[PDB]
Design a protein around this motif. Structure first.
Motif, PDB file in Angstrom:
ATOM      1  N   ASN A  19       0.851  -1.227   0.000  1.00  0.00           N
ATOM      2  CA  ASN A  19       0.000   0.000   0.000  1.00  0.00           C
ATOM      3  C   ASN A  19       0.878   1.266   0.000  1.00  0.00           C
ATOM      4  N   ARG A  40      -7.174  -6.081  -3.120  1.00  0.00           N
ATOM      5  CA  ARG A  40      -7.060  -4.618  -2.889  1.00  0.00           C
ATOM      6  C   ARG A  40      -5.620  -4.162  -3.192  1.00  0.00           C
ATOM      7  N   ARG A  41      -4.639  -4.991  -2.801  1.00  0.00           N
ATOM      8  CA  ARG A  41      -3.199  -4.934  -3.208  1.00  0.00           C
ATOM      9  C   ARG A  41      -3.071  -4.848  -4.742  1.00  0.00           C
ATOM     10  N   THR A  91      -8.684   4.544  -1.280  1.00  0.00           N
ATOM     11  CA  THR A  91      -7.996   3.364  -0.691  1.00  0.00           C
ATOM     12  C   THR A  91      -8.602   2.951   0.660  1.00  0.00           C
TER      13      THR A  91
END
Length: 283
Positions: free
Chosen positions: A13, A71-72, A97
């Motif tokens: 992230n 999500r990565r 995010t």
């Protein structure tokens, strides 16, 4: 200023926040579904932008209940795209995010994917308009190449077009996975040697896809038949009305010895001469 492979970051992230400006969800309007991606629906809509004048934006959503390992991966596109600034590379507006539905906000490209766009306008663009679309794509890929970024998935379905027919490289990800064989160089398929040289082989297919108005490379030939075919020295022919000089640039892109292929720098030159005069695209 060179591309920073995000995957060297440990915490994936931290790459997003360095490369992709976080946006406020209340400044983002979704108006319309226009597609679906790996990770969820692509929509058209609006962002502002204090500055002034609502900007038209494409919005890629990550569907609710994503896994950590989506999500990565989904946001990996922002980390790469946000390092780039060039007229022929799709612009990142920013990301969402946390605290709100996860999104990548991208400049709106009115005409969508170049392959679907050319099928709908079959036979409507002159050689000099088509040469121009590829000049753009080549200018993009030269910048991506000078930045040390290798695309690995250059195809007309991954090039976006705006309402001035400016073509832009999109779909950032850096035959392992989705990289399909009929766009990939022999040494990338067989040996996973992905380089700008192998992107140029793929650019060569994009040339064929463009001049054929979104025909499927190699038509209905199976992946295996395409590989034996290319292995025997089969190369695709000049689509209808495609000058021999353009088809010749295609054949050079499709040299089996990767060092014999033109660099994007040379491709832009060969395409500019052709805009400036027949070329002559036959002579």
């Amino acid at each position: 200023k060179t591309y920073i492979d995000p995957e060297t970051y440990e915490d994936p992230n931290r790459a997003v926040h360095q490369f992709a400006k976080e946006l406020d969800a209340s400044c983002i309007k979704i108006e319309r579904v226009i597609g679906a991606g790996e990770f969820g629906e692509v929509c058209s809509g609006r962002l502002k932008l204090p500055e002034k004048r609502d900007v038209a934006v494409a919005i890629k959503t990550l569907k609710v209940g994503y896994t950590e390992k989506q999500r990565r991966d989904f946001l990996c596109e922002a980390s790469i795209m946000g390092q780039f600034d060039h007229p022929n590379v799709v612009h990142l507006e920013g990301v969402v995010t946390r605290g709100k539905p996860v999104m990548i906000v991208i400049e709106f490209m009115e005409n969508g994917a170049l392959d679907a766009f050319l099928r709908k306008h079959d036979g409507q663009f002159t050689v000099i308009q088509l040469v121009g679309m590829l000049r753009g794509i080549a200018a993009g890929m030269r910048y991506l190449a000078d930045m040390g970024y290798v695309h690995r998935d250059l195809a007309a379905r991954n090039i976006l077009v705006n309402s001035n027919l400016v073509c832009k490289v999109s779909d950032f990800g850096l035959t392992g996975g989705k990289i399909p064989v009929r766009w990939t160089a022999p040494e990338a398929i067989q040996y996973r040697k992905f380089t700008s040289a192998s992107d140029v082989w793929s650019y060569g297919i994009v040339m064929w896809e463009v001049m054929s108005y979104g025909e499927r490379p190699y038509w209905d030939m199976s992946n295996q038949d395409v590989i034996k075919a290319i292995e025997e020295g089969y190369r695709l022919p000049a689509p209808m009305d495609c000058p021999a000089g353009l088809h010749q640039l295609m054949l050079d892109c499709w040299q089996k010895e990767r060092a014999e292929r033109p660099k994007f720098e040379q491709i832009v030159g060969i395409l500019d001469k052709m805009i400036r005069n027949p070329n002559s695209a036959h002579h």
